[PDB]
């Protein structure tokens, strides 16, 4: 019956002292890993005799590797314990938290296997980027994060229509903008895919200004694009906000009922 005891500790950290210390230790090392991954890219100043300033992760590669190894070992022991204490192991493995944990730990081991290709870009940059998904292990510590996941899953059809109608509007407005603006002098609107960038920046009302229309037709269709983007993006926002509040309120009804 020790397996179910360990599982109960893992699922309910606040029931047991050992569960709670495990909870806090893992949360602390998630924060440590995230901060280290950010900090290792910061220029640490020019080293003695160095041509240029070196990133902290390059100047202290051993220290950052040791910190990464400690965090990854903690995450791996955590995941292996969760797998060991799972009632239905396959059901655990296919759960979203398990996918998050596996995505968090895999890049370290892949980078070990591909240590010869560490200098080679492409894969190195991909592993570096995938290291940032360890921040999703905070979903086990944040109830709001889990509720956000539940509401995104709940609003799947509205998010799908958001993607589809946004794609439609982007294509339409980029076509019109490209044909209105391609003849301008030194035009940034060099193709319809190039005009995708302008269209998405206009629809969200970012307005970077790196791409701006210069013709009258360009101005007219850019204005219409901004308004249409406002409408398209506003369509699913009330649904998402309402479902988030509904799930939060259901959680707090359950909490006050059982306590």
């Amino acid at each position: 019956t020790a397996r179910q005891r360990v599982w109960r500790a893992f699922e309910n950290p606040h029931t047991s002292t050992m569960a709670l210390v495990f909870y806090y230790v893992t949360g602390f090392f998630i924060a440590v890993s995230v901060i280290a991954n950010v900090v290792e890219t910061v220029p640490c100043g020019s080293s003695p005799g160095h041509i240029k300033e070196l990133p902290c992760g390059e100047r202290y590669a051993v220290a950052f590797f040791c910190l990464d190894t400690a965090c990854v070992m903690i995450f791996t022991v955590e995941y292996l314990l969760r797998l060991a204490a799972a009632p239905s192991r396959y059901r655990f493995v296919r759960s979203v938290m398990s996918i998050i944990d596996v995505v968090a730990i895999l890049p370290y081991y892949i980078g070990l296997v591909m240590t010869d290709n560490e200098d080679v870009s492409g894969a190195f940059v991909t592993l570096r980027v995938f290291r940032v998904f360890r921040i999703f292990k905070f979903s086990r510590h944040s109830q709001g994060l889990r509720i956000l996941g539940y509401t995104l899953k709940s609003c799947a059809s509205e998010l799908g229509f958001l993607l589809f109608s946004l794609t439609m509007a982007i294509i339409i407005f980029a076509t019109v903008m490209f044909y209105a603006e391609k003849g301008s002098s030194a035009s940034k609107f060099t193709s319809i895919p190039a005009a995708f960038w302008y269209t998405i920046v206009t629809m969200t009302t970012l307005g970077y200004g790196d791409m701006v229309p210069k013709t009258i037709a360009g101005k007219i269709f850019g204005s219409i694009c901004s308004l249409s983007g406002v409408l398209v993006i506003a369509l699913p926002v009330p649904v998402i906000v309402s479902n988030f509040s509904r799930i939060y309120h259901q959680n707090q009804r359950a909490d006050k009922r059982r306590a």
Partner: peptide, 23 residues
């Protein structure tokens, strides 16, 4: 619960530091 977690955190941090100093 907080105290034991803090103690474990300090132990593991010390081990990381000693590993760094060794290498």
């Amino acid at each position: 619960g907080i105290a034991i977690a803090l103690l474990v955190i300090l132990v593991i941090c010390s081990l990381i530091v000693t590993s760094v100093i060794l290498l």
